[model samples]
Target: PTHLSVDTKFKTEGLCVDIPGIPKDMTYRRLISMMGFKMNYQVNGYPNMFITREEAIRHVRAWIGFDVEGCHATGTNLPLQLGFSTGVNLVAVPTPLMYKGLPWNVVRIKIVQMLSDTLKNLSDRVVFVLWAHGFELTSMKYFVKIGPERTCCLCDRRATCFSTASDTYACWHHSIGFDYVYNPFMIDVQQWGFTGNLQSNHDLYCQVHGNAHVASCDAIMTRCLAVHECFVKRVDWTIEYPIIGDELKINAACRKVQHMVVKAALLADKFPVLHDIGNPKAIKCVPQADVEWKFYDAQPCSDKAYKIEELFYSYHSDKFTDGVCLFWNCNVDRYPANSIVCRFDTRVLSNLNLPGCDGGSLYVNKHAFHTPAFDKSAFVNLKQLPFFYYSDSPCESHGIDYVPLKSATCITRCNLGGAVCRHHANEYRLYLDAYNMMISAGFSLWVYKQFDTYNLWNTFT
Candidate 1:
């Protein structure tokens, strides 16, 4: 009789073990063997292939599910939770490229510092939550060693000192002068400096040498730092498997894995495609220069006023619906003397309807409402309106005819109840009336569910 025999191969030479019942798709037998062979060839029996001691420790911690000893200078055992429980939850830190040219140790130190500062007021539970999200124990040796006594070479300010040798130490305010030296993102065509993978010579030129002005470099860097800070501050340790007793320990382990993934992703060869062949048309074009033959050649007044009729007719006719027309008309008529007032006030009252009129009837006396006093009053009201209110009873008789007036009166009454209005015909009064009616009628609602659910009277007696 023929019998099925399982092939159990323990090949120590190839560093592989073939066992029955192991799913073929899930098993990494071949890949593991290849890795083992490569490791053996590179390190000669040792599996560790770290470029630095820190890297080696990070890998070890990730594998062992805990922080390794003598890894960080702070001795603050790996993964720590940091952040405000009430504020925005932490997300992934900014890409490593944001900290380019800085020593890895310095970057880690800054991240740790930011986390420590933010965590001061946070709850221990929240801290644990952050740890679970993969916050790391960064070495602060670089920052601690470089004290405030050190002089800044770029700004020539002795007071301006480095926390670390990295460019991050350069104060954002004083660093403007040394933007050329510190701004790694800055595209310098003169110097052959490029970021990301360069496909060809042209690609290299576009990345490094392209004459593109640094438009949003500061904003981008700020945004990136904000993201990094958020990650460092809020990342939680609860995301790791097998719910560990020590949140910090689990966090540290997760952080090592997270950093590895981040580094790998950043180092991966990828190139961005430039859509335009050359500089944009707007940048390429030069504005015409004016040369005046005579000094008194009717130098045009920089401040010019528009006529009421001109203002009314200037808007796109097709775009002006019944609602928009009402808004535009009311805005124009209110400030006949001061075009600026009319222009601004009209914009304010556009979406808002009068107490008695339907959406259509609100703009009938728009010009009258746009007067300077009304415009000014409207601005005052805009500045001071209560969020919500309740009343003792209906001040006016309840009826269908009274609906429009009641709607208007309800707003004024509610405003009064909430101490939002002290005088009649205030812009806030007008706005509050319209706004309250819209709120009550289920027309306009707060976008956020929490705000919508908030009770107005909860704050007051």
Candidate 2:
């Protein structure tokens, strides 16, 4: 059977979890009771941990069968970290993608181990959910906003229609274009939200990101690094009052605490974290923007594969939380690769260049290209990445295939159904190159006359 052959594993995303450093914190029973999602939580060594290992095994199966994106803790201000590394396949957890981090990482692995022992020959189709929630293109439909400010998240401007296909209809100004049109196989989609599922909004289905009204699940922390995430889009809140204002208010309070990352932004000198490309503005502003105030805990966002100054420029009007990578505006085949990606939020859509396109060819029209994640946002000098450090060209030493090498990581890995990928050495520094001449060309000439001309104009204008 196709479902009974290959070995599968999972990695971690930076989730903000709240663990009890002391015994007096609270019982696991009380803790699970408080959580919004049902689960069999496994804390280290507690006096009276209610759930059994067997029960955890059962829950893990449910998560894997249905696939939880593990973003339910979307609205918690609790501490978070890079709970696990990216590439490591087998940890200790045995559950859905959502419960891949923290104490649950190991918990889910146990179930996997048990499953392996039980069914050594009955599984294939490894659901290597590449990145965290909301990252795939198919999941885009649920991410659209309600009325009032409904439009593409990347551009603040409203549109009559939308399509990912690169065509005359998808011009840079009239439509916020993406590269998926030519190559839909390369899904750059991403979202870090809840474990809940709406099943489908129309043609799309949202397996991750549950109700915004529910409190965050305790087992998992906040969302992790993704491609096109929901939190990056503008969120429209519907405040239902009068009949049952108290519970509704409590829901609002939980979501507010999550975005308290920039507590003192109201009267700040330079709170770059609030508006800069480092993170979404939605993740910075709370319901207490100008009114009621409360103290918030400042949990340092994890340092590993983390964020800092510069590299992250930062977005939104239609109240859209839209997000995309560098390709949203310019094209590698057209512009200088090193042209600084002419990132987003540096200026408004009106002032920046908007060279329209006829769309006869598959080219992304250049515009303000307000796709978020601009401005050195999570700057990874992809060409100089370690993947190409050891090998000069490309090979099948580890069965690892380079899918027409694009950014830092795989173009389309883990799939292909049967690709032989192996481990290689990690021996190299930042700018060394036995690398290919073609890929290096992007970062190579930005300083040259050709690259400099556009960059200077984009920077100045």
lDDT by residue (tens digit), candidate 2, 1-461: 21211112111221122222323333333432333222234231222212232222111111111112323332333212211111112222123122334443233323333323322221111111222332121121221111121333444433222243432222123333322111001111112233442222200322233333211211111221121122112211221112211223323433332232122222221211222223222232444444322222222111112232212224122111121122111222222222222222212222111111111111011201113222342334322112222122233343223333222322113212233234212212211232222122111211112211111112111
Give stretches of model 2 more than 4 Å off.
1-113, 116-254, 259-276, 279-284, 287-461
The root-mean-square deviation over C-alpha atoms between each candidate and the true structure, in angstroms, is 26.9, 26.6
Clashing residue pairs in all predictions, respectively, total: 22, 47
Candidate 1 segments whose C-alpha is farther than 4 A from its true place: 1-113, 119-318, 324-461
lDDT of 2 at 181: 16
Instruction: Please give the lDDT score at residue 149 for candidate 1.
Output: 32
Quantify how close model 2 is to the true structure by its C-alpha RMSD in Å: 26.6
